[PDB]
Amino acid sequence: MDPEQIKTALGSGLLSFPVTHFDAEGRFAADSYREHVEWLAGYKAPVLFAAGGTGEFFSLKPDEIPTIVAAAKEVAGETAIVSGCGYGTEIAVDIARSVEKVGADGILLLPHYLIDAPQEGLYAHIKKVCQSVGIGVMVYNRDNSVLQADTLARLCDECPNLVGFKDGTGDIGLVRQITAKMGDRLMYLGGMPTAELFAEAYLGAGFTTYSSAVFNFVPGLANEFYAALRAGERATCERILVDFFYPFMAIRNRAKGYAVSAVKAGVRLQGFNAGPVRAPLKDLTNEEIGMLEALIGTHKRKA
Amino acid sequence: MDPEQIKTALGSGLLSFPVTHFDAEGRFAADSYREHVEWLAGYKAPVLFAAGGTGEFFSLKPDEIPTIVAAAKEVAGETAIVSGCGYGTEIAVDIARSVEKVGADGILLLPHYLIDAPQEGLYAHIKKVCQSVGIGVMVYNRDNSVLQADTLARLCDECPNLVGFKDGTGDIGLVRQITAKMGDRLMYLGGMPTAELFAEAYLGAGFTTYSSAVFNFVPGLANEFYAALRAGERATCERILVDFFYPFMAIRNRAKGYAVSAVKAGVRLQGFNAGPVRAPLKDLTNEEIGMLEALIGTHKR
Amino acid sequence: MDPEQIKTALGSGLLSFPVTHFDAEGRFAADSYREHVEWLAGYKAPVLFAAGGTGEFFSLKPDEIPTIVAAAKEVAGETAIVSGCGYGTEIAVDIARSVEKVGADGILLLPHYLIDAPQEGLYAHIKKVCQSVGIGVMVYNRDNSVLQADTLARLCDECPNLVGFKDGTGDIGLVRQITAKMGDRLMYLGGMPTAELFAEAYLGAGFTTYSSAVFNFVPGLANEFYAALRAGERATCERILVDFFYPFMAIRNRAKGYAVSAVKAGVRLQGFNAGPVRAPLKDLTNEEIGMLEALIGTHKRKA
Amino acid sequence: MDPEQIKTALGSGLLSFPVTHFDAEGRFAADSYREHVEWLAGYKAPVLFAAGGTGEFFSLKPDEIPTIVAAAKEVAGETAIVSGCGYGTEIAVDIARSVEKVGADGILLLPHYLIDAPQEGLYAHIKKVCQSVGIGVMVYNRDNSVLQADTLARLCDECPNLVGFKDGTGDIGLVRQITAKMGDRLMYLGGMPTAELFAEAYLGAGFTTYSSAVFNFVPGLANEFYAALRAGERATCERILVDFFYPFMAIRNRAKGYAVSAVKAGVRLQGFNAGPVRAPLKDLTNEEIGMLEALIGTHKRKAW
Ligand SMILES: *[C@@H](CCCC(=O)O)C(=O)O
Ligand SMILES: *[C@@H](CCCC(=O)O)C(=O)O
Ligand SMILES: *[C@@H](CCCC(=O)O)C(=O)O
Ligand SMILES: *[C@H](CCCC(=O)O)C(=O)O
Numbered sequence A, C: 001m002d003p004e005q006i007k008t009a010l011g012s013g014l015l016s017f018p019v020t021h022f023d024a025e026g027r028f029a030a031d032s033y034r035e036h037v038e039w040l041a042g043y044k045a046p047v048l049f050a051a052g053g054t055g056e057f058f059s060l061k062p063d064e065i066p067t068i069v070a071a072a073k074e075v076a077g078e079t080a081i082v083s084g085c086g087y088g089t090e091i092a093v094d095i096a097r098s099v100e101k102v103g104a105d106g107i108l109l110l111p112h113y114l115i116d117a118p119q120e121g122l123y124a125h126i127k128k129v130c131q132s133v134g135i136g137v138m139v140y141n142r143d144n145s146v147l148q149a150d151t152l153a154r155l156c157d158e159c160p161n162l163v164g165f166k167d168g169t170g171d172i173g174l175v176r177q178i179t180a181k182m183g184d185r186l187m188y189l190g191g192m193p194t195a196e197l198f199a200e201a202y203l204g205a206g207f208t209t210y211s212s213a214v215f216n217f218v219p220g221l222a223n224e225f226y227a228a229l230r231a232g233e234r235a236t237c238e239r240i241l242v243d244f245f246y247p248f249m250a251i252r253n254r255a256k257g258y259a260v261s262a263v264k265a266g267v268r269l270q271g272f273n274a275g276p277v278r279a280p281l282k283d284l285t286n287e288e289i290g291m292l293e294a295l296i297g298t299h300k301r302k303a
Numbered sequence B: 001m002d003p004e005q006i007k008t009a010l011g012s013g014l015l016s017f018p019v020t021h022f023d024a025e026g027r028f029a030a031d032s033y034r035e036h037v038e039w040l041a042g043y044k045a046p047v048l049f050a051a052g053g054t055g056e057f058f059s060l061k062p063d064e065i066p067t068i069v070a071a072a073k074e075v076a077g078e079t080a081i082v083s084g085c086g087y088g089t090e091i092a093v094d095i096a097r098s099v100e101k102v103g104a105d106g107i108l109l110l111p112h113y114l115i116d117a118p119q120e121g122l123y124a125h126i127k128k129v130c131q132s133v134g135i136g137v138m139v140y141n142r143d144n145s146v147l148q149a150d151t152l153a154r155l156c157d158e159c160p161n162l163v164g165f166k167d168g169t170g171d172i173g174l175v176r177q178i179t180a181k182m183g184d185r186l187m188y189l190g191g192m193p194t195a196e197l198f199a200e201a202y203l204g205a206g207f208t209t210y211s212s213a214v215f216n217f218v219p220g221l222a223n224e225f226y227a228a229l230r231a232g233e234r235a236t237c238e239r240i241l242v243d244f245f246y247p248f249m250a251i252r253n254r255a256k257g258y259a260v261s262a263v264k265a266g267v268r269l270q271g272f273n274a275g276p277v278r279a280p281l282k283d284l285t286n287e288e289i290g291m292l293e294a295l296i297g298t299h300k301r
Numbered sequence D: 001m002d003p004e005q006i007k008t009a010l011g012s013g014l015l016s017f018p019v020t021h022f023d024a025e026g027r028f029a030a031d032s033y034r035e036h037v038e039w040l041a042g043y044k045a046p047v048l049f050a051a052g053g054t055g056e057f058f059s060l061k062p063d064e065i066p067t068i069v070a071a072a073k074e075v076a077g078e079t080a081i082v083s084g085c086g087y088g089t090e091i092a093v094d095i096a097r098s099v100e101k102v103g104a105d106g107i108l109l110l111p112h113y114l115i116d117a118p119q120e121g122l123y124a125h126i127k128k129v130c131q132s133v134g135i136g137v138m139v140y141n142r143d144n145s146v147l148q149a150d151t152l153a154r155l156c157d158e159c160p161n162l163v164g165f166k167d168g169t170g171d172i173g174l175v176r177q178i179t180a181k182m183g184d185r186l187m188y189l190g191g192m193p194t195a196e197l198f199a200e201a202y203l204g205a206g207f208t209t210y211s212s213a214v215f216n217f218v219p220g221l222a223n224e225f226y227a228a229l230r231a232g233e234r235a236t237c238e239r240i241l242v243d244f245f246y247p248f249m250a251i252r253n254r255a256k257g258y259a260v261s262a263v264k265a266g267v268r269l270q271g272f273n274a275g276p277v278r279a280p281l282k283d284l285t286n287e288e289i290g291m292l293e294a295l296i297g298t299h300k301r302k303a304w
Helices: A003-010 A030-041 A064-076 A089-101 A119-131 A149-158 A172-185 A199-204 A219-231 A234-252 A258-269 A286-299 B003-010 B030-041 B064-076 B089-101 B119-130 B149-158 B172-185 B199-204 B219-231 B234-252 B258-269 B286-299 C003-010 C030-041 C064-074 C089-100 C119-131 C149-156 C172-185 C196-204 C219-231 C234-252 C258-269 C286-299 D003-011 D030-042 D064-075 D089-101 D119-132 D149-158 D172-185 D196-204 D219-230 D234-252 D258-269 D286-299
Strands: A047-050 A080-085 A106-109 A136-141 A162-167 A187-190 B047-050 B080-085 B106-109 B136-141 B162-167 B187-190 C047-050 C080-085 C106-109 C136-141 C162-167 C187-190 D047-050 D080-085 D106-109 D136-141 D162-167 D187-190
Touching: A003 A047, A003 A080, A003 A136, A003 A162, A003 A187, A030 A064, A047 A064, A064 A080, A064 A089, A080 A089, A089 A106, A089 A119, A106 A119, A106 A162, A119 A136, A119 A149, A149 A162, A149 A172, A162 A172, A172 A187, A172 B199, A172 B234, A199 A219, A199 A234, A199 B172, A199 B199, A219 A234, A234 A258, A234 A286, A234 B172, A258 A286, B003 B047, B003 B080, B003 B106, B003 B136, B003 B162, B003 B187, B030 B047, B030 B064, B047 B064, B064 B080, B064 B089, B080 B089, B089 B106, B089 B119, B106 B119, B119 B136, B119 B149, B149 B162, B149 B172, B162 B172, B172 B187, B187 B199, B199 B219, B219 B234, B234 B258, B234 B286, B258 B286, C003 C047, C003 C080, C003 C136, C003 C162, C003 C187, C030 C047, C030 C064, C047 C064, C064 C080, C064 C089, C080 C089, C089 C106, C089 C119, C106 C162, C119 C136, C119 C149, C149 C162, C149 C172, C162 C172, C172 C187, C172 D196, C172 D234, C187 C196, C196 C219, C196 C234, C196 D172, C196 D196, C219 C234, C234 C258, C234 C286, C234 D172, C258 C286, D003 D047, D003 D080, D003 D106, D003 D136, D003 D162, D003 D187, D030 D064, D047 D064, D064 D080, D064 D089, D080 D089, D089 D106, D089 D119, D106 D119, D106 D162, D119 D136, D119 D149, D149 D162, D149 D172, D162 D172, D172 D187, D187 D196, D196 D219, D196 D234, D219 D234, D234 D258, D234 D286, D258 D286
Parallel strands: A047 A080, A080 A106, A106 A136, A136 A162, A162 A187, B047 B080, B080 B106, B106 B136, B136 B162, B162 B187, C047 C080, C080 C106, C106 C136, C136 C162, C162 C187, D047 D080, D080 D106, D106 D136, D136 D162, D162 D187
Antiparallel strands: none
16 A cells, blocks of 8 residues: 555554564464464454564564565455564665565664664665655654654655654653644654553643554453543543553563563463564563463453 | 642642842842742742742752742742752751741652662651641652652652652653552642643643743743643644744753753843852853843743 | 872872761761771771761761761871762852861862753852862762863862862763873872772773772771782782672662662671661661671671 | 684784775775775784674675675785674574685674663573684673673683673773673673773773774874883873874764764775765764864875
C-alpha cells in the first residue's frame, strides 16, 4: 500500500509488535510465529510491526528480516505490515529495499549504530533511507538518534513518504513541541517500554495511539485499556494500571533487556513456542517466569 | 489555615512563585517585593509561594525566609502564602517553625542539600520536618530527592498535614504511578521551571494544576493559556506555545540558571525593581534582555 | 597559619576526614569526637578536615561547625585543621568567618546548594567567599559545582589564598588539564569516595595526595597503602585493593549514602562512640555491620 | 599470528587506527588508503586496526570490511593488522570469520547494537564471537557494552584467544579493578577519544599502552608524546598537551562525531585524499578545517 494509506492505518487503532520466534538452536521458527500472529489477528490491531525491537530486530541478520516479514504477511490478513529497519545508511538502505520487495507496507527506522551524531548527519542518514524506497517511513527517536523539531520538519518537507514518528525518549517537553510544530503532517506513536504507563500523558501531548508490547500475550487486556483510554474512562485505566501494569513493571525492572524478555516469556506462558531470546538478552529465571504466570492469572489462554 | 484548607486552595487554580527582590548591594527589598506581589494577587492566583525556587530560595539565609513571607502576607489578600523550606533536616525544621510563626499557610519542602540519599533516609527527613509544624506540607520531587510512590504513600499515612506533591523531574512515568496510587489523598502540582510546556501531558497524568514562573511578568498571558487548557481549547494553547513559550525556551536554554534569571529579567522589564540575581546565577546580557523585551511586546506594561 | 603554610601541609602526607559523632538524641558529642580524633592523630596524617562531607557537613547546622572545629583543634596536636564550608554565597561567608575566628587553618568549600550554574556565576560565588577570609581555601569539584581550567585560573589570579583543589568528579580528562595548566600554583587532592581505588591513577594525573575516609577506622591499612603507593610498590597496593577495597566497595554500594554510613559503621566497630548518621543518610543494617566486621578482621582495634 | 603473538605485538608500542578513505561517492578508496597506511608504516606502530571506530566501522557494510583489511595488509609490512568487528552476535560472527579468512591477526569487538544488556548476555554474546575464530580477540568497554571485572574473568577462563581489553568509558575506578583482577592475563589498551589526554593516569592504572587517533595525521608528534610518557618526561608530555592536545580538544568538541571527523580532516590536510565521512557523521566546515590546519602548523607534511 502507499504512504498515505499506511499513515491512515497507523491512526486507526492499537499497534502491536510481535516477538520473533526462535527454535532451541536460535533460528527463526516460522511455523510458531505464524501461529502466534494468526492468534493476534483475531484481536484486530490495524498495524503489525514485524521485527521491531520487541521482535529483536537488533539481533537479526539482515537476510533474516525479509523472511520474518513474509511469514507475518501470510496470516496477517487485512493488517498493514511494517518492518523494522536500522543500522547505518548502507545496511539500512539494503534492508529497506529487501522488505519493500516482499511487500512490506512501510518501515520503522530504528537508530543508527554506536555513535552520537550531529543533527545535520541524522537528517542526511534518514533522508537517504527514505529516498531508497517508495513505501511509508516511520522515524524513531531514541538513544543515539533524537531528532529535534526543526530537523524533523526539514525531513518531512523533503520526504513525502515520511508519515510517522515513534517516540522512545520519554521527553514530554520535546514530543509536545514536535506535535505542535508538525500537526497532522505526521501520525504520532507512543513507543516507550510498556507504553500504557505513558498513554494518558501522551494523549495530552497529542499521541492517540502507541505500541503495546503486552498485547503479545494479553491482547484482550491491552484492547480494554486502549478503549478505556479513548473513551475517557479514567477509573478503568487506573484499575488496569494498578492491577496489571505496575506489577508487570516490577518484573520488567529486575534486569536489563526484560522489556523484551518478560514479553516473550509471556508469549511462551500463553502456550506459543516463541523460544529463547538471542544473546545478549537473557531469558527470565524460573522464579521470574512463575511471578509472571501468577500475574497473568485470570487472563491465561490455557490451563 | 489548616492543612486541608491549603490543600483546597492549592488545587483551585494557577499557581505562582514570585521572584525575590534585591537592592544593588544585595539585601532583600521589601517595598519593591510588596508592590510586585500585590500586582500579582490582582491577577487572582489562589496561592503564592514566597522564596521558592524561582524566588531563589537556594540563595537565601535561613533568617531571610520569614521576612519575605511576612512581606508577601502584608499584601497577598485572599491569596494564601506558602513558604519555601529546605536544606538538611536540622535547618529545615528551624526554617519551618520560623515561617509558621509569621503565619505561613504552608511549606514547600525543597530537596535536602548535596547528597544522594536512600528512600528510607528521605522518609526520615521529610517525616521529621512535617511533624515539627501544624500547617500543610507539599513535598517536591527533583534532583537528589525523588520519592518513590510507596515511600510517598508511607509518609501520607504517617503525616496527615502532608497534602501536596510538586514535580520537577519530568519523569512522566513515575508521576502517573504516584497519582494512580495516592489518588485524592494529595493535590498534584506541575513544577517544571517552564511548566506550560508540560501542562497538557501533566493533566493527562492526573495533575490537579501547575505553577507558572512566567506569570511573574506576563500574568495575563499565563492566565490565558491556563483557561484554554481547562476548557480544552487545544488550538489556543498551541498558538501561545508556538509564539511565546518555545521562543522563551530558546532564550532560557542559552545559559544555566536562566529558568530563574530570565523570569527575573522579565519582571524588571515590566517596571518592578526586582534587582539582580545573587551568585552563582547570572543575569541576562543586554542582548538577551532585548530578545525577551521583543518577545513580551504586546504584553508590555 | 598563613595560606602558603596550610598549602605546604596539605601536600606533605595523607589526609582524612573524621566522621562527626552525634549522641543518640542527635546532638554533637564532643567527648567522643576528641577521643576518636586523638587516636587518629597518632597515625600522623598532617592535615585534618573537620566537618567535611565524610563528617556530614551537609547535615550540620551552621552553628555546630565552629564548635566541631574547636573540638577538633584541642586534641589535634600540631596536625593542621581545615573546616568544611558551603551552601549559597551568603551562608558560606558566614560559615567561613565563624570558623576562622576559632583557629581554622583553612577551608574546604563544598558546592553551593541545589542549582546548576554558569561558570561566571561559580566564579563570582567562589571569589567573594575567598575574599571574606584570610586563611587558605581549597575548592571542591563535584556535582553542581565543576570548575573548568580557565575559570579556575582566573580565580587563582584574583585570590592568593586559594591554594588547594579537591576533585570529586572522577573526570580524568578535566583534572589532568587542570594540573597541566595550573602547575604548582595549586595542591591537588584526590577526593573520590574511597579514593584509594583512584590514587594510582591520580598520581599519574599529577595529584600530590588524596584523602582516605577509611583512615577513620583502619588507619593502619591507609598508611600501609599510601606508603606502598609512594615507594612504587604496586604489588602491595594491589593486594590491599583486592583484599580490602573492592570488598568494602561491594558493601558501600549496597545503598546510597553509604560512602559515609559504612565509614561511620567502621568507626563504631573499632569502638569509638560515633553513633548514628543524621537523616537523610541511614545506617547499615546489622547484617551489613556483620559484613563489615568480618572484613576489618585482623585490623580490628584491640584492647 | 596466533593469540599470544598478537598479545605481544599489542603490548610493544603505540597503536593506531587508520581512517577509512572514501571517494566522493562514498565508496571505499583503496589507492589512497594503502598510500596513507604505507606512510604510517614508516613510523613503526606495531599494530594497525583496520576498520575500527576511527575507521568508521559503524558505517561500513560487512562485506566491505574484508576488502579494507586486505588493502591495509598489502602495505603494512610486519605490522600486526587487527580488524574491527561488531553488532549483534550473528553479524559479528560472520565478520569475524570473513576477516580471519583474509588473514587478519586479530579482531577488536565493538559493542553490540542498540540495547542495554545484562552481564550474562554480554558474557554469552562475546563468548560466542570468540569461539567462532582462532585468532586473537580484543574486547572493548564502551557505551551499551561495559563488562564488569567478574564477567571478564569468566570470559578469560573460558576463551584463551581473548587476549586484550580496550577502554572507552574513562571509568578509572572500574579499569583499575579490571587490571588488578586479571593481571597479565590481558594486555590493556587505552581507548578514549584523544587518549593522550588520559595516557598518564591510565599507565598509573596499569594500562599496557594506548591508541592515538591523531597519529593518523601527526604521527611524529604522537610518537614523541609516547616516548616521553614511557621515559617519565612529564614536562615534555605537558608541553605537548598544552600546545597541541587541548587546542585539538577544543576543535573536536564543536560538534558530535568530530572525534572521527576532525582526525579525517587532519589526514586530508596532510595531503592524503581520505575523502568525506559517511552520514551520520558530518565533515568539518571550511572554517574549522582552517583552525585545524593552523594548529598542525610546524608539523605539516606538505605545502599546498
Ligand atoms: C518499539 C515498541 C516498544 C514497546 C515496548 O517496549 O513496550 C519497538 O519495539 O521497536
Ligand atoms: C518550583 C518550580 C515553580 C516554577 C514556577 O514558578 O511555576 C520552584 O520554583 O520552587
Ligand atoms: C578506538 C580508538 C579510539 C581513539 C580515539 O578516538 O582517539 C577505535 O576507533 O576503535
Ligand atoms: C571529601 C571526600 C572523601 C571521600 C572518600 O575518600 O571516601 C569530603 O568528604 O569532603
